[PDB]
Amino acid sequence: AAYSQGGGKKKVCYYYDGDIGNYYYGQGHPMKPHRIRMTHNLLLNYGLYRKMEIYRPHKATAEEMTKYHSDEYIKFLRSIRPDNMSEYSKQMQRFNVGEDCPVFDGLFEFCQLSTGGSVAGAVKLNRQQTDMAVNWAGGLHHAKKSEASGFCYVNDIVLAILELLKYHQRVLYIDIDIHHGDGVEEAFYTTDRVMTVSFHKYGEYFPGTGDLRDIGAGKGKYYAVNFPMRDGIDDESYGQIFKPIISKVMEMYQPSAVVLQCGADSLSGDRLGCFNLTVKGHAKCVEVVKTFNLPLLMLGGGGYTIRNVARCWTYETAVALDCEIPNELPYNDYFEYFGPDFKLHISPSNMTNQNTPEYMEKIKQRLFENLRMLP
Amino acid sequence: XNPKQXWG
Ligand code: NA
Ligand code: NA
Ligand SMILES: [Zn+2]
């Protein structure tokens, strides 16, 4: 196979459970698993199922989850229900459930399906049976070893990376959610076998971590990379730092597999976010990573203006497939959600970009200094 | 991370 030049269309395996959209976090809660069903239905109506393999994930077992999470926390998640909450008030506080991370009907099953897609995708990659695996129900990057955080309960990303590490010496994690990928970075902070790269809003903003001076520790020193940003970053600003940083990371770290969290709360108009990317600017990140021709697990994450989440992950599936799709949306079960325009692509707002071009270049220059410290 | 409620 010495003739390979690393191009070609890529084999894509996509994971989805038709039950996922029915899980409900509660009245007024911004996290809406329904957006995954909206994404699926939109990409079915564009015909993208003709171009990829579609799999229904298994329900990951408590035991699969305790490859990272503590036994006590997973036992709690398996046991807690809206009808027995009163008896668990102490454990709810200890594991940080019942505020941002509510108890809801089927919580554990939702975690099992989110996680099952990511671990199943990792196995498929390890078996060299696909180039890309996609799980838009995964990417729940804030969950910690023994606590929920940030609408995330089980860290499917950490579990998928642990699976990749069975066959890959070095794994690269890239996080374009507007929030810092703190749960993933914490899990791998002291190893060089996982490099974590997060771009995120930083300053009076959840979760409060991801300073560019957070670079890892011990054998993991220089293997955590954080790009802190201000409100209002736009396509042009993002694209001028993302490809140079990822290219330098690829050059210095030479990973053999990549996990890309595609949290869509970095889009213009997100309910919780303060960035100004379009779907095209967000998806340029997938294009950039895809060109390195490494085994790639693409995951979901945040995204709280759900019409735009469905647009984003539909277009990023098309990008993974190297399929052009029209801007005019096909009819679909959720067509009214996409008015008044009924187009796939979105316009940025007139919000001010507080990330000056000088700020962007200066942060990039500082991270390049840290990347020079790899062997 | 919800501005409308809590500390996240
Ligand atoms: Na991020
Ligand atoms: Na690391
Ligand atoms: Zn987020």
Numbering used by the authors:
A (entry chain A): 5 to 379
B (entry chain F): 500 to 507
The publication says:
To address this challenge, we develop a computational “anchor extension” methodology for targeting protein interfaces by extending a peptide chain around a non-canonical amino acid residue anchor.
In two of the protein chains of the asymmetric unit (chains B and C), the peptide conformation was very similar to the design model, but the observed binding mode to HDAC2 differed from that of the design model.
